[PDB]
Amino acid sequence: FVNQHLCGSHLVEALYLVCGERGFFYTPRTEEGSRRSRGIVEQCCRSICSLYQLENYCG
Numbered sequence: 773f774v775n776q777h778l779c780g781s782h783l784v785e786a787l788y789l790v791c792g793e794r795g796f797f798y799t800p801r802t803e804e805g806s807r808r809s810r811g812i813v814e815q816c817c818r819s820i821c822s823l824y825q826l827e828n829y830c831g
Contacts, residue, residue, distance in 0.1 A: 778826070779817035786816075790823050791830030 778786050787796040799809045812829050815821050 773823075775820060777817050777820055779813070783813060783816055783826075787826050787829060790826040794830040796826075796829040796831065 773786055773789070776782075784798055787798075790796070796812075799805070799813070802809050805813065812825075815825060
């Protein structure tokens with residue numbers, strides 16, 4: 773996509789394209805964040821992660 777920090781819907785709205793039909797897994801209830809989450813949300817939201825990383829959760 774363009775180039776900015778993905779936070780919340782911006783992350784989903786983005787992974788949705790990266791994964792296309794493969795889909796990705798978003799915190800189903802860990803909305804608080806724990807071992808994971810900060811790996812996908814903060815990594816991208818906190819820092820501009822390249823599609824390569826967003827493409828890492830497509831599954």
